[model samples]
Target: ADYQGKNVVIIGLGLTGLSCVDFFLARGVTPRVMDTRMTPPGLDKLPEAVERHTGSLNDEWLMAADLIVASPGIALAHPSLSAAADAGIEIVGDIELFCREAQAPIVAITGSNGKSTVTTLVGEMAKAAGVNVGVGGNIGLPALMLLDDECELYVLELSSFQLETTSSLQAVAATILNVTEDHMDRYPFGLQQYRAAKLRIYENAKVCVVNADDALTMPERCVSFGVNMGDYHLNHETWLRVKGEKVLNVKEMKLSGQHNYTNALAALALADAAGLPRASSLKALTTFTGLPHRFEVVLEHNGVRWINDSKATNVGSTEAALNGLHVDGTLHLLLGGDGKSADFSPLARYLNGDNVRLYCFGRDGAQLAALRPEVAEQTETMEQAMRLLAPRVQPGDMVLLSPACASLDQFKNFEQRGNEFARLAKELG
Candidate 1:
């Protein structure tokens, strides 16, 4: 609470960094901003009074600050953070700082795949129950930008990178959806470190919600949900049940997949823990249209469906996307991108039957092809993939762009890659 008139230095000028700058400046604390980029993007939106140290972070900049707030995107051993840590200065991320100052009871969500969906659903359910909620973290808005003096409840979508630098911040209700092999490059190419970081969200939580079906997360929570033998799941006669209690029977929610049914149960349980009515939560679940790039229906062309799931940047995420789709015909699955450090052997399990046909692209096409020679047909670029699939795809088939790798090798990011896929799919007709 002693931030007023102090010299706060913020590192990395991404969305999280900009939010930190704005949050401090509004409270009379002028922060010194440093970024590694030659010219940080979105500089025009920054406050005029804030000092900019461009190109890279220096030793002098780290020593002169009272506190340093680093973006979650950067590694913990980043030069600026290392300098700050060496100087004995208190360091934290945008999420950590926001949580420290927030007076509201917090409900935090984190995992390898479903953080965004679960976080958004929890917020929607609370709103439907008539609770004044502030939802933001790894999703809609940066948490620092939404901080206020009188917010009643804060729902956050936390990422593993964000969790690494956070401490002493606990959520009243926390959920770890599932943990799988992801961001292995950041954790010495080890899955355990990444899984450990995801588990940190439940450190000081009052109630921990976990996926009953997930092998990694079932042991850490008091309550679990899924379509299995746990607290919640989907049935033919009853749509969803929580902790053996039948809350809703509506079978036509906009979202698909057994994973989504699990995600919905996690949200419902979190809402119930917050004292929200079960009826209100059920109504909210029925009306919620899921987030983009997670089984998002982009367009339908000539009886062939085009689905964009650009957010599936890992094998687990890609598997979830494929599992969610009701693959009827020859599923023309477009995959591969900037490769992450993980084996694609598990993905072969999904591509077993003739119902799916794989088209590989981006930097990792060759690698993906080697993993599963039977299912994969290699293509060099998104353009090439579209051209080749045009002749082969049948009337009832689906052309799905669900890359199980990052998009930085050829595209700006996943969203850009997804847009290009949609554009090419539309142009083919």
Candidate 2:
């Protein structure tokens, strides 16, 4: 579809929306914008001549669009958007637009969790092989911003929300790392609906990367990875074996936890699928410590470990954090926040363990405490929760803030929450 001289309407004036505006303007089109917030973050960046509406969507203006480039933040099921869709208007997100225009091959990664780690690792592997790689989508930069003339490969961390508005993304390799209940508030139909949105990444993928351990991620045919099974798996519990060849050692990797190792395996499979040199990919893994706030060790005071896994803003991630650790002393686990209406049932088994103690705080504190009442304590804030557990924490114990929910209820984001946790631990010690 020719964007030039078309009536393009961009919904949401966030980063993605602003990128869409630039994309259209560059191609001799200026899209009208709509955002629910009166002063959306990126509104100031828009040119003075570009028309915009805020506080509420303009249904009439939306219906007049020849195409609608929506930000992933806004739901398509929105009454006006859905109405326009029913009337045969073309609606797409930045990823879809990027897909249509991108000249380079793309490696897409999406899951309830672990995608950022995998995406970044693959980007590094591409760089190690001397390929010009662009890494961003749901991680660093918006998808549209990653478009570059010199880029050889594009590694994208896609969220389910982003996936919903993307259709033409035919990736060189794509994987839904693992699907677990997340963003329940977004999908009215529950996990199945959210899972469906994630599965879209595999539709036009040349190589479908599947997690053997997670049946939900398995497509009709695919490259696979897991702890002890699949084409890429751990050999002798220490070596990362890719297609029966022992390639990299677990100890050589700076990233700890079984989940991070599993992520490494996924990255290798993705890089291989994209036709990257195996040796360079392996080299990249050795130096890659991992992203911050993901199983990040804040400090070790008197043998007690304080870990900020504030990135675990969902149940499955928190589950991975718990499963990966072999705790000798009581596991002081901080949990709660805006749960996004996810079911906390799956976490019950991990929390009910004898050596585990739960400190719940923020929005859904009481709800999480109900899972393991015998050992659970509810607090008003994350800081209060930590203060309450400070006296009880013994040497050899680990304090892990793996809140199975979002950080929006308290701090700015998971990074801020994790930073505060780190700062508090350092000060209290």
Candidate 3:
């Protein structure tokens, strides 16, 4: 409550929850926190002054709380949160509190796919323009931590989970990029719930940017960006404004893949909305190499290339990566992991029998390959799949490690999975 020092209860003691505790303490509130884990990751890091409840949730503390600040990982349907809401106790998130205190303009971006790319690209553009920009929130540091950075501008990467608990966020410019299916396990109501949470980015935005092609993202009044038509669209391979004002040369853009045009367009549109010159923003667009494990060409040994697109944890991302790069050679694709309740059959359309082959692994491997029995094979592990694939991969062929699922089933995360693939591939040749 805006430094009112109301008694607060925080659920989850992870990174996000710890940030909330710091904010509450800074506002002169001695917070009471609880975590589901018997031994939370950073329990010792917390101040001894704050009350701690572990192993089980304490209902009395929750009900007595004047306000509850929850981590994004905490579900809205949790018994404690639901009862608290029913009692009219105020509940919010770190972003809501951060928004209330933030004094600078915010460029908030959210979508099922490509948020990381766009967030970083916008930060780069701001840096190129010499603006003191703070970039984090659901991407790097927590939103509260950015305040300590003392930036004039904040470029936040909002997630649907974060937006679910944020109500007071009023961005200078905000956008929901292409609304694609993701986080299915968290949103049981399917895309609608996730889409609604993402739309919160526009709740009090001064300017709104929409994806012209993704109708689910557009609002009644907004600037649009897309590949074919919008305020920003392509003139052949070159990016242009709707009125024929040249923005940047796409050929000079360091990032590969046509889907990345959407990311570049978003960064440019947002930087311009924040009053930066297109010239300054264009430098980042040309110079910014894409993030790691996102269709990164890690090796080309024996004339056979290997692409690590391990960040494709959902169907939409994998589809985008495959559709963007499935052009030059025969594709020996790696697929599977924790499917996250995704509909993998859609990916089958991208598989042409003549030029494409699938080597599936992880928890959903056999199940995913069952959809494409003609061309797909299920293996016990990625290394096993690699062993089988090594010989079949001809000189002109490409091995793409774009698992349309999460890596928790087989590895720690996508980065580790991607690194393992790179290491395994390097050893092969």
Best by lDDT: 2
User: Candidate 3's residue-wise lDDT over 202-256, tens digit each?
Assistant: 9889889999899999654488988888887876756655546886768888886
Tens-digit lDDT string for candidate 1 (1-429):
779766688888878888888888777788988888777664667788888888878668778778888888678787667767887988888888887789888998888888899898888988887888899988748898667776678899998998888886778888888888888778884877788888888888888887777867743447777775677676754578765567777575777677888888888888887777888888889999988778788888788888888878889888887665676578988888876777888887677776877789988898888766887789888789878888888888888888898887788533688788778878884
Residue runs of model 3 more than 4 Å from their true location after superposition: 44-50, 327-329, 379-384, 410-414
Ranking by TM-score: 2, 3, 1
lDDT of 2 at 120: 93
Clashes of each: 0, 0, 0
Q: What is the lDDT of residue 365 in candidate 1?
A: 92
The per-prediction CA RMSD against the true structure, in angstroms, equals: 2.5, 2.0, 2.4
TM-score pick, better of 1 and 2: 2
TM-score per candidate, in order? Answer: 0.91, 0.94, 0.92
lDDT-best of 2 and 3: 2
> lDDT: which is higher, 1 or 3?
3
lDDT of each: 0.81, 0.90, 0.85
